[PDB]
Design a protein around this ligand. Structure first.
Ligand SMILES: *[C@@H]1O[C@H](CO)[C@@H](O[C@@H]2O[C@H](CO)[C@@H](O)[C@H](O)[C@H]2NC(C)=O)[C@H](O)[C@H]1NC(C)=O
Lengths: 49, 40
């Protein structure tokens, strides 16, 4: 899920890495803006019966 | 970074951001500064 990012990437910085070497923030090549990256919601499904 | 001292390196901490990456790939083994410019 792409969202507007309030992170202040420095002019030379493009990607934002997390602990797992995963990009949690990117900079759009066309427009010079930084977008947060959040994975689509996931979780287990339990059947109560 | 503005430093009042001109004779000794100051004390503190600051990080240098990159300015430009030149893709040239030469030997640089020796280098010299270019100052502003001996019989008498
Ligand atoms: C970069 O240029 C330098 C020029 O000095 C080369 O350095 C020489 O490399 C040969 C390797 O066969 C050596 O026999 C010489 O002794 C080196 N000269 C000096 C003054 O040290 C070099 O080949 C070029 N490439 C690299 C990886 O250095």
């Amino acid at each position: 899920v792409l969202t507007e990012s309030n992170k202040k990437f420095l002019p030379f910085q493009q990607f934002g890495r997390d602990i797992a070497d995963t990009t949690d923030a990117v900079r759009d090549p066309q427009t010079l803006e930084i977008l947060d990256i959040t994975p689509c919601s996931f979780g287990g499904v339990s059947v109560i019966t | 970074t503005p430093i009042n001292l001109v004779r000794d390196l100051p004390q503190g901490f600051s990080a240098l951001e990159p300015l430009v990456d030149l893709p040239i790939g030469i030997n640089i083994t020796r280098f010299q500064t270019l100052l502003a410019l001996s019989s008498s």
